PDB file of C-alpha atoms and ligand atoms in Angstrom:
ATOM      1  CA  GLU Y   1      23.287 -31.838 -17.689  1.00 27.39           C
ATOM      2  CA  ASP Y   2      20.055 -31.394 -19.967  1.00 31.45           C
ATOM      3  CA  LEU Y   3      17.311 -29.773 -17.367  1.00 36.15           C
ATOM      4  CA  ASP Y   4      15.950 -26.197 -18.613  1.00 37.20           C
ATOM      5  CA  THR Y   5      14.173 -24.294 -15.841  1.00 38.75           C
ATOM      6  CA  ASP Y   6      13.750 -21.043 -17.578  1.00 37.71           C
ATOM      7  CA  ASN Y   7      12.063 -22.807 -20.946  1.00 37.80           C
ATOM      8  CA  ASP Y   8      14.883 -21.575 -23.547  1.00 36.20           C
ATOM      9  CA  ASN Y   9      16.912 -24.164 -25.637  1.00 33.46           C
ATOM     10  CA  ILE Y  10      20.294 -23.408 -23.359  1.00 30.96           C
ATOM     11  CA  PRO Y  11      20.402 -25.871 -20.347  1.00 30.03           C
ATOM     12  CA  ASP Y  12      20.807 -24.698 -16.774  1.00 30.64           C
ATOM     13  CA  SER Y  13      24.629 -26.011 -15.955  1.00 30.17           C
ATOM     14  CA  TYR Y  14      25.539 -24.144 -19.766  1.00 29.41           C
ATOM     15  CA  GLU Y  15      24.390 -21.075 -18.740  1.00 29.45           C
ATOM     16  CA  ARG Y  16      25.669 -21.202 -15.513  1.00 31.53           C
ATOM     17  CA  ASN Y  17      29.377 -22.173 -16.775  1.00 32.47           C
ATOM     18  CA  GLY Y  18      29.179 -20.693 -20.193  1.00 30.08           C
ATOM     19  CA  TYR Y  19      28.475 -21.791 -23.628  1.00 29.55           C
ATOM     20  CA  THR Y  20      28.737 -20.869 -27.256  1.00 28.40           C
ATOM     21  CA  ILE Y  21      26.286 -21.254 -30.434  1.00 29.20           C
ATOM     22  CA  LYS Y  22      27.342 -23.427 -33.347  1.00 29.87           C
ATOM     23  CA  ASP Y  23      24.654 -24.600 -36.064  1.00 29.71           C
ATOM     24  CA  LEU Y  24      22.121 -23.109 -34.172  1.00 29.25           C
ATOM     25  CA  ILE Y  25      22.391 -25.127 -30.735  1.00 28.74           C
ATOM     26  CA  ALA Y  26      24.397 -24.439 -27.434  1.00 26.33           C
ATOM     27  CA  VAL Y  27      27.280 -26.363 -26.534  1.00 25.77           C
ATOM     28  CA  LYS Y  28      29.532 -26.207 -23.958  1.00 24.44           C
ATOM     29  CA  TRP Y  29      32.440 -23.508 -23.931  1.00 22.33           C
ATOM     30  CA  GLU Y  30      35.904 -24.864 -24.433  1.00 20.62           C
ATOM     31  CA  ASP Y  31      39.088 -22.197 -24.394  1.00 17.52           C
ATOM     32  CA  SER Y  32      40.232 -23.628 -27.883  1.00 17.25           C
ATOM     33  CA  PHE Y  33      37.193 -22.309 -29.662  1.00 15.94           C
ATOM     34  CA  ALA Y  34      38.171 -18.691 -29.071  1.00 15.34           C
ATOM     35  CA  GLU Y  35      40.759 -18.585 -32.065  1.00 15.54           C
ATOM     36  CA  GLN Y  36      37.978 -19.429 -34.530  1.00 17.90           C
ATOM     37  CA  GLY Y  37      36.353 -16.518 -33.529  1.00 19.87           C
ATOM     38  CA  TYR Y  38      33.704 -17.955 -31.211  1.00 17.75           C
ATOM     39  CA  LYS Y  39      32.166 -16.051 -27.911  1.00 18.99           C
ATOM     40  CA  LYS Y  40      31.809 -16.826 -24.369  1.00 18.76           C
ATOM     41  CA  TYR Y  41      28.136 -16.286 -23.060  1.00 19.00           C
ATOM     42  CA  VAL Y  42      26.843 -16.848 -19.757  1.00 20.31           C
ATOM     43  CA  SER Y  43      23.308 -15.715 -18.917  1.00 19.22           C
ATOM     44  CA  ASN Y  44      20.698 -16.509 -16.219  1.00 18.90           C
ATOM     45  CA  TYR Y  45      19.391 -19.902 -15.881  1.00 18.78           C
ATOM     46  CA  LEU Y  46      16.419 -18.724 -13.865  1.00 17.40           C
ATOM     47  CA  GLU Y  47      15.393 -16.239 -16.450  1.00 15.68           C
ATOM     48  CA  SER Y  48      14.391 -16.087 -20.067  1.00 13.38           C
ATOM     49  CA  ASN Y  49      15.358 -12.759 -20.633  1.00 11.39           C
ATOM     50  CA  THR Y  50      18.231 -11.905 -18.749  1.00 11.68           C
ATOM     51  CA  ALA Y  51      18.646  -8.412 -19.681  1.00 11.25           C
ATOM     52  CA  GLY Y  52      14.638  -7.790 -20.088  1.00  9.37           C
ATOM     53  CA  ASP Y  53      14.743  -6.911 -23.959  1.00  9.61           C
ATOM     54  CA  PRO Y  54      12.025  -8.762 -25.972  1.00 11.44           C
ATOM     55  CA  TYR Y  55      14.468 -11.373 -27.447  1.00 13.09           C
ATOM     56  CA  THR Y  56      15.408 -14.212 -25.187  1.00 15.92           C
ATOM     57  CA  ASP Y  57      18.737 -15.381 -24.334  1.00 17.67           C
ATOM     58  CA  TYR Y  58      18.666 -17.960 -27.118  1.00 19.92           C
ATOM     59  CA  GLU Y  59      17.530 -15.630 -29.819  1.00 19.57           C
ATOM     60  CA  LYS Y  60      20.142 -13.069 -28.630  1.00 20.78           C
ATOM     61  CA  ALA Y  61      22.823 -15.427 -28.532  1.00 18.25           C
ATOM     62  CA  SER Y  62      22.134 -17.326 -31.861  1.00 15.23           C
ATOM     63  CA  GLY Y  63      21.435 -14.286 -33.465  1.00 16.94           C
ATOM     64  CA  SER Y  64      17.988 -14.875 -34.391  1.00 18.19           C
ATOM     65  CA  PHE Y  65      16.356 -11.494 -34.289  1.00 19.88           C
ATOM     66  CA  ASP Y  66      16.182  -8.615 -36.483  1.00 17.53           C
ATOM     67  CA  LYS Y  67      19.596  -8.602 -38.523  1.00 16.39           C
ATOM     68  CA  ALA Y  68      19.836  -4.970 -38.165  1.00 17.07           C
ATOM     69  CA  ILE Y  69      20.802  -5.165 -34.786  1.00 15.04           C
ATOM     70  CA  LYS Y  70      24.467  -4.384 -33.503  1.00 20.40           C
ATOM     71  CA  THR Y  71      26.775  -7.286 -32.965  1.00 21.75           C
ATOM     72  CA  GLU Y  72      27.501  -6.204 -29.474  1.00 23.76           C
ATOM     73  CA  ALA Y  73      23.893  -6.645 -28.412  1.00 24.80           C
ATOM     74  CA  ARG Y  74      24.425 -10.508 -28.772  1.00 22.59           C
ATOM     75  CA  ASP Y  75      25.568 -11.304 -25.576  1.00 24.36           C
ATOM     76  CA  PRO Y  76      22.375 -12.045 -23.006  1.00 23.17           C
ATOM     77  CA  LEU Y  77      24.089  -9.403 -20.716  1.00 25.46           C
ATOM     78  CA  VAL Y  78      23.665  -6.311 -23.093  1.00 30.51           C
ATOM     79  CA  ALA Y  79      20.376  -5.274 -23.796  1.00 33.09           C
ATOM     80  CA  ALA Y  80      19.172  -4.154 -27.477  1.00 36.25           C
ATOM     81  CA  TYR Y  81      17.772  -0.915 -26.756  1.00 37.75           C
ATOM     82  CA  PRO Y  82      17.682   2.146 -28.756  1.00 37.24           C
ATOM     83  CA  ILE Y  83      18.372   5.803 -27.186  1.00 35.68           C
ATOM     84  CA  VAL Y  84      16.926   7.968 -30.305  1.00 34.81           C
ATOM     85  CA  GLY Y  85      16.715  11.685 -29.734  1.00 32.71           C
ATOM     86  CA  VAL Y  86      15.807  15.124 -31.356  1.00 30.41           C
ATOM     87  CA  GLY Y  87      17.841  18.125 -32.022  1.00 33.15           C
ATOM     88  CA  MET Y  88      16.866  21.538 -34.099  1.00 29.99           C
ATOM     89  CA  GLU Y  89      18.639  23.168 -36.598  1.00 30.66           C
TER      90      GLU Y  89
ATOM     91  CA  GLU C   1       0.214 -31.203   2.740  1.00 28.82           C
ATOM     92  CA  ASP C   2      -0.319 -30.807  -1.104  1.00 29.58           C
ATOM     93  CA  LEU C   3      -3.852 -29.405  -1.321  1.00 31.33           C
ATOM     94  CA  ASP C   4      -4.290 -26.333  -3.466  1.00 30.87           C
ATOM     95  CA  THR C   5      -7.781 -24.327  -3.160  1.00 28.30           C
ATOM     96  CA  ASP C   6      -7.314 -21.208  -4.609  1.00 28.02           C
ATOM     97  CA  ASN C   7      -5.418 -22.607  -7.084  1.00 25.62           C
ATOM     98  CA  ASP C   8      -2.113 -20.923  -7.466  1.00 28.59           C
ATOM     99  CA  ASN C   9       1.430 -22.431  -7.273  1.00 29.94           C
ATOM    100  CA  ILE C  10       1.346 -22.378  -3.491  1.00 28.95           C
ATOM    101  CA  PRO C  11      -0.140 -25.081  -1.157  1.00 27.00           C
ATOM    102  CA  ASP C  12      -2.991 -25.021   1.252  1.00 28.65           C
ATOM    103  CA  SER C  13      -0.924 -24.882   4.546  1.00 29.74           C
ATOM    104  CA  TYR C  14       1.753 -23.373   3.166  1.00 31.62           C
ATOM    105  CA  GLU C  15       0.148 -20.099   3.084  1.00 31.43           C
ATOM    106  CA  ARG C  16      -1.394 -20.464   6.597  1.00 34.35           C
ATOM    107  CA  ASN C  17       1.883 -20.939   8.232  1.00 34.42           C
ATOM    108  CA  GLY C  18       4.628 -19.747   6.183  1.00 32.49           C
ATOM    109  CA  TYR C  19       6.344 -19.992   3.040  1.00 29.31           C
ATOM    110  CA  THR C  20       9.336 -18.715   0.842  1.00 33.86           C
ATOM    111  CA  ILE C  21      10.324 -18.817  -2.664  1.00 32.60           C
ATOM    112  CA  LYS C  22      13.591 -20.565  -3.807  1.00 35.30           C
ATOM    113  CA  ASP C  23      14.460 -22.110  -7.686  1.00 33.22           C
ATOM    114  CA  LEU C  24      10.864 -20.645  -8.496  1.00 33.35           C
ATOM    115  CA  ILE C  25       9.430 -23.110  -6.195  1.00 29.37           C
ATOM    116  CA  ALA C  26       7.259 -22.327  -2.830  1.00 29.62           C
ATOM    117  CA  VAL C  27       8.594 -24.310   0.352  1.00 25.53           C
ATOM    118  CA  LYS C  28       8.384 -24.179   3.980  1.00 28.09           C
ATOM    119  CA  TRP C  29       9.655 -21.265   6.120  1.00 27.09           C
ATOM    120  CA  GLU C  30      12.698 -21.837   8.508  1.00 27.54           C
ATOM    121  CA  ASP C  31      14.077 -19.476  10.436  1.00 26.15           C
ATOM    122  CA  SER C  32      17.733 -20.715   9.610  1.00 23.72           C
ATOM    123  CA  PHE C  33      16.692 -19.097   6.231  1.00 23.17           C
ATOM    124  CA  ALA C  34      16.618 -15.641   7.011  1.00 22.98           C
ATOM    125  CA  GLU C  35      20.387 -15.143   7.333  1.00 22.12           C
ATOM    126  CA  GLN C  36      20.898 -15.933   3.735  1.00 23.63           C
ATOM    127  CA  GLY C  37      18.333 -12.805   2.887  1.00 23.12           C
ATOM    128  CA  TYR C  38      15.182 -15.025   2.555  1.00 22.70           C
ATOM    129  CA  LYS C  39      11.737 -13.657   3.478  1.00 22.37           C
ATOM    130  CA  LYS C  40       9.113 -15.081   5.071  1.00 20.44           C
ATOM    131  CA  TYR C  41       5.697 -14.615   3.203  1.00 20.70           C
ATOM    132  CA  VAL C  42       1.825 -15.379   4.648  1.00 19.20           C
ATOM    133  CA  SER C  43      -1.360 -15.495   2.355  1.00 19.07           C
ATOM    134  CA  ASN C  44      -4.660 -16.303   2.160  1.00 23.25           C
ATOM    135  CA  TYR C  45      -5.301 -19.676   0.855  1.00 24.40           C
ATOM    136  CA  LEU C  46      -9.292 -19.001  -0.214  1.00 21.81           C
ATOM    137  CA  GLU C  47      -8.003 -15.885  -2.444  1.00 25.17           C
ATOM    138  CA  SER C  48      -5.862 -15.994  -5.636  1.00 27.59           C
ATOM    139  CA  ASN C  49      -5.216 -12.285  -5.367  1.00 31.93           C
ATOM    140  CA  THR C  50      -4.809 -11.485  -1.462  1.00 31.05           C
ATOM    141  CA  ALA C  51      -3.655  -7.597  -2.154  1.00 32.03           C
ATOM    142  CA  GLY C  52      -6.390  -7.334  -4.952  1.00 28.96           C
ATOM    143  CA  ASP C  53      -3.821  -6.184  -7.347  1.00 31.23           C
ATOM    144  CA  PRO C  54      -4.050  -7.956 -10.782  1.00 29.54           C
ATOM    145  CA  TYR C  55      -1.017 -10.082 -10.082  1.00 26.80           C
ATOM    146  CA  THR C  56      -1.673 -13.511  -7.958  1.00 27.44           C
ATOM    147  CA  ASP C  57       0.031 -14.782  -4.838  1.00 25.59           C
ATOM    148  CA  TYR C  58       2.788 -16.566  -6.761  1.00 25.84           C
ATOM    149  CA  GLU C  59       4.009 -14.241  -8.880  1.00 23.67           C
ATOM    150  CA  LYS C  60       4.641 -11.204  -6.058  1.00 22.85           C
ATOM    151  CA  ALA C  61       6.162 -13.758  -4.073  1.00 20.45           C
ATOM    152  CA  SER C  62       8.670 -14.969  -7.079  1.00 22.13           C
ATOM    153  CA  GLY C  63       9.141 -11.663  -8.568  1.00 23.89           C
ATOM    154  CA  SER C  64       7.623 -13.012 -12.146  1.00 25.57           C
ATOM    155  CA  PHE C  65       6.222  -9.494 -12.945  1.00 26.62           C
ATOM    156  CA  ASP C  66       7.657  -6.338 -14.249  1.00 23.84           C
ATOM    157  CA  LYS C  67      10.891  -5.860 -13.075  1.00 24.00           C
ATOM    158  CA  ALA C  68      10.275  -1.990 -12.406  1.00 26.93           C
ATOM    159  CA  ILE C  69       8.211  -2.511  -9.489  1.00 26.94           C
ATOM    160  CA  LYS C  70       9.426  -2.101  -5.963  1.00 24.72           C
ATOM    161  CA  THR C  71      10.572  -4.949  -4.093  1.00 25.01           C
ATOM    162  CA  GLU C  72       8.653  -4.026  -1.127  1.00 26.97           C
ATOM    163  CA  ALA C  73       5.489  -4.829  -3.196  1.00 24.27           C
ATOM    164  CA  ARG C  74       6.500  -8.618  -3.193  1.00 26.35           C
ATOM    165  CA  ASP C  75       5.258  -9.939  -0.535  1.00 24.23           C
ATOM    166  CA  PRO C  76       1.351 -10.861  -1.109  1.00 23.79           C
ATOM    167  CA  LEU C  77       0.138  -8.607   1.914  1.00 25.84           C
ATOM    168  CA  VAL C  78       1.256  -5.360  -0.067  1.00 29.54           C
ATOM    169  CA  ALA C  79      -0.495  -3.592  -3.091  1.00 31.38           C
ATOM    170  CA  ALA C  80       1.376  -3.064  -6.492  1.00 31.64           C
ATOM    171  CA  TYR C  81      -0.415   0.204  -6.830  1.00 30.74           C
ATOM    172  CA  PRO C  82       0.892   3.321  -8.470  1.00 34.39           C
ATOM    173  CA  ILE C  83       0.071   6.808  -6.681  1.00 33.45           C
ATOM    174  CA  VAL C  84       0.323   9.549  -9.616  1.00 33.42           C
ATOM    175  CA  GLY C  85      -0.166  13.409  -9.114  1.00 30.67           C
ATOM    176  CA  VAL C  86       0.072  16.638 -11.228  1.00 32.68           C
ATOM    177  CA  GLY C  87       1.772  19.941  -9.963  1.00 32.97           C
ATOM    178  CA  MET C  88       1.418  23.240 -11.694  1.00 36.05           C
ATOM    179  CA  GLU C  89       4.403  25.506 -12.019  1.00 37.21           C
TER     180      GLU C  89
HETATM  181 CA1   CA I 101      17.744 -22.398 -19.372  1.00 37.03          CA
HETATM  182 CA1   CA I 102      18.071 -17.666 -19.173  1.00 35.83          CA
HETATM  183 CA1   CA I 103      -2.654 -22.135  -2.713  1.00 38.29          CA
HETATM  184 CA1   CA I 104      -3.665 -17.313  -1.982  1.00 43.60          CA
END
């Protein structure tokens, strides 16, 4: 309902069932939201960083991190992580 | 009961007899919990770090540390301790 355990801005049941971010707040997910371009997010309600990256579930879902991070890292289940490598010429 | 001497988050009489961590809260151990995959933990109620590693009994038991640590270092009786060596080729 409104209980928060991992102490982010997303309640327990919202993460357990499904939520989306609009106007910088978390709301329950409804299937009619998809055709507006919204996305369905599920996270871990006992952890503040589900993926393990420095950014928390709220920051990732609401896109409050560095704006250069790819949009496919916004869902909490995908980690924001670089794969930098070196090649010789 | 509810006394806490070493000032971790685990009560005095729980560490003496046995406890398990669920929902980030220490509870008494019942033998019916074993088939669910839970484990029985016993610690030292006069020390905040039974093994001597940097992580306390509560952090070790609840798995609230670096997620790269092996799961066999979660009971508060096995030290989280690396063994690093060098070999020449
Ligand atoms: Ca939460
Ligand atoms: Ca979470
Ligand atoms: Ca204690
Ligand atoms: Ca202790």
